[PDB]
Paper text:
Peptidyl dipeptidase A is a highly glycosylated ectoenzyme that cleaves dipeptides from the C-terminus of a broad range of oligopeptides. AnCE is a single-domain glycosylated protein that closely shares enzymatic properties with human ACE (in particular the C-domain of human somatic ACE) and is inhibited by classic inhibitors of the human enzymes 14–17. In this study, we elucidate how the natural peptides Ang II (the principal end-product of the renin-angiotensin–aldosterone system), Arg–Pro–Pro (the BK-derived peptide) and bradykinin-potentiating peptide-b (BPPb, a snake venom inhibitor) bind to the active site of AnCE, revealing novel interactions involving several enzyme subsites. Comparison of the four structures clearly shows a common mode of peptide binding to AnCE.
Therefore, it was not surprising that the structures of AnCE in complex with BK and Thr6–BK showed Arg–Pro–Pro bound in a similar fashion in the active site cleft. Strong hydrogen bond interactions with AnCE anchor the main chain of the N-terminal Arg (P1) at the S1 site (His367, His371 and Tyr507), which is also involved in coordination with the zinc ion. Furthermore, the side chain for this residue is stabilized through contact with Tyr496. Additionally, both structures bind a citrate ion (from the crystallization medium) at the same position, making contact with the N-terminus of the bound BK (1-3) peptide. The citrate ion also interacts directly with the AnCE main chain and the surrounding water molecules. The two Pro residues at positions P1′ and P2′ form a strong interaction with AnCE through hydrogen bonds with residues His497, His337 and Tyr504, Lys495 respectively. The general mode of binding for BK (1-3) appears similar to that of Ang II, particularly through the various hydrogen bonds with AnCE. Experimental evidence suggests a preferred affinity for Pro at the S2′ binding site and highlights the importance of the hydrophobic pocket (formed by residues Phe441, Phe511, Tyr504 and Tyr507) for peptide recognition, which allows the products of BK and Thr6–BK hydrolysis to shift position and ‘register’ in the active site subsites. In both cases, complete hydrolysis of the peptide to the end point resulted in clear visible electron density for the tripeptide (Arg–Pro–Pro) in their respective crystal structures.
Author numbering: 17 to 614
Write the structure that this text describes.
Amino acid sequence: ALVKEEIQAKEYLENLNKELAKRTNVETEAAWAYGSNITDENEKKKNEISAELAKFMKEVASDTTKFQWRSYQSEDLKRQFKALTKLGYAALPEDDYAELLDTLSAMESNFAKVKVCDYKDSTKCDLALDPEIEEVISKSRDHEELAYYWREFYDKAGTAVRSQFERYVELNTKAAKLNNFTSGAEAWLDEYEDDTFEQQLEDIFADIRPLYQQIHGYVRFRLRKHYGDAVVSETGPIPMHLLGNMWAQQWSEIADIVSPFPEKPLVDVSAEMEKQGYTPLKMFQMGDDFFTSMNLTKLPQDFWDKSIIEKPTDGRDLVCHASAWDFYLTDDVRIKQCTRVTQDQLFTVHHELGHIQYFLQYQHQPFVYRTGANPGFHEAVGDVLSLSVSTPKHLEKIGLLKDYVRDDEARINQLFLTALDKIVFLPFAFTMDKYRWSLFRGEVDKANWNCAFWKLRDEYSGIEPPVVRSEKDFDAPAKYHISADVEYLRYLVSFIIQFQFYKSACIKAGQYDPDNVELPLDNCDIYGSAAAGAAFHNMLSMGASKPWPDALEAFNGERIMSGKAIAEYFEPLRVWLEAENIKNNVHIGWTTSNKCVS
Ligand SMILES: *[C@@H]1O[C@H](CO)[C@@H](O[C@@H]2O[C@H](CO)[C@@H](O[C@@H]3O[C@H](CO[C@H]4O[C@H](CO)[C@@H](O)[C@H](O)[C@@H]4O)[C@@H](O)[C@H](O[C@H]4O[C@H](CO[C@@H]5O[C@H](CO)[C@@H](O)[C@H](O)[C@@H]5O)[C@@H](O)[C@H](O)[C@@H]4O)[C@@H]3O)[C@H](O)[C@H]2NC(C)=O)[C@H](O)[C@H]1NC(C)=O
Ligand SMILES: [Zn+2]
């Protein structure tokens, strides 16, 4: 009888979910120990426990065939069983899974251990990406110095790992096919539960792309005035080392030389943070305050007790790329961040605390539901708060921005600053997964892998390497997420939907009205808003219990991912920028790059 079996299945699921949570706790603890302290011993422990959990997952997936779950009445029960059938990498044979884990840790440890020699001191060779190299890329305006650090880092973080990356692609593909996906692309895309998801993103990207072109053109124009035409051409792709970021993913670090109105205020509170004696602890406490002010959950004692919020001062190797950790018990949540006292880092703190909040909000759910509605939702939470933190309105409240006059010109400066982070990022994010998808799908021959990467960066972002690269180089793994096997489409989704969340939260807070000149979207602060917090609670507490459109509906009554909100935010910038580019006869678009030899 199916009626009797469905009752037994419910009891089966409740026990199994609790078992999976407990087993994942053990794996997570070992993964935490390795990421905070990279050693051969900790790698071995992390990978051996993962192999053990994978073995158990195999048994679980096999056990689901004993239940007629597709025949059940409960949509909830069917959804849980469906989740249990999806093995991911755990579908691989024992030896293949062990090899993949060895390959993944080899790539992540390589990235984390990268050290370069000082440009001015060839005997000082202990400069790591975080913070040494990133500080130079963000602050130096010496184009040759920038080019040196670009080359040194990409050679060490990218090229050195080509063979491991090749084996990773092979095993990722094998795993996907064992789960009956065509490739790792489809495996990743399955997390969005929508068979038109790629086309939806193409459509949204196409709408925002013209604005990006205008920003690109104007920045290129302004860079030519700074560096001269020998360094930056009018018609070519922008040399990427000049954009204030190792991967040219976000350009806010060069705002001081590309700002629309240089005589008017440009928000950079890093100096005031230092002057007021800000610490990493204070920054996290302020983040905690923001969430609690919205009637959301305070950080538990375990967070403060166990988190790493500063780069360790011993000689040890660790992964410094910030991360949040759910240990699948009650209130055992942690962040690992190599925190610095800067404005950008203040946003990063809020980003990571967004993940933590999500963990706390759904910790009551069955294990399989203890994750985001889709990967983009998880990335978006903290960024919604960061948008309000970034406003002159909020920064004045916390005394970090002083003597600020919010006229038309200062507003354009602030909108442009935000766009250098939010619009510029969109083509970058798309290319990270367009690249990996093409490799996963077997669409690029191995002899063309490196120039396939730079071709996409050219086509979509209009940027290029500072020096000529070839198929002797392999540059993709120089980006953390590529070395660390972290899906990137989540960020494209996040940057779109975070404006849907922000707009709705702002309206709920009484902080945005499109017909009121005193309440513009770009100066909305949701701090202290219980109404905005209620929307977050309603959505986040769901976890992955329902398909993501239901989670969006719980927030604001909408069911569709839309670029309307992000375009609405930047509309006043679009009007000004289009006119400014025409006024200055600014060239738009770029010729095909010559910087990757086939
Ligand atoms: C990815 O896709 C794969 C297919 O491309 C898929 O692999 C298939 O999984 C099937 C299991 O669902 C499996 O089907 C079984 O086949 C057995 C014989 O297969 C042999 O010969 C094949 C060549 O003809 C070889 O290719 C194989 O290697 C094998 O050597 C059958 O003996 C078996 O049967 C039994 O089970 C059925 C199922 O019963 C179902 O459930 C209830 C049970 O209570 C039934 O009431 C209900 O009616 C329903 O049918 C019984 O009906 C039957 O009485 C037997 O007990 C079964 O059909 C198949 O072999 C396998 N490979 C191929 C090539 O087809 C993967 O599983 C997919 N992977 C994932 C992760 O989804
Ligand atoms: Zn994140």
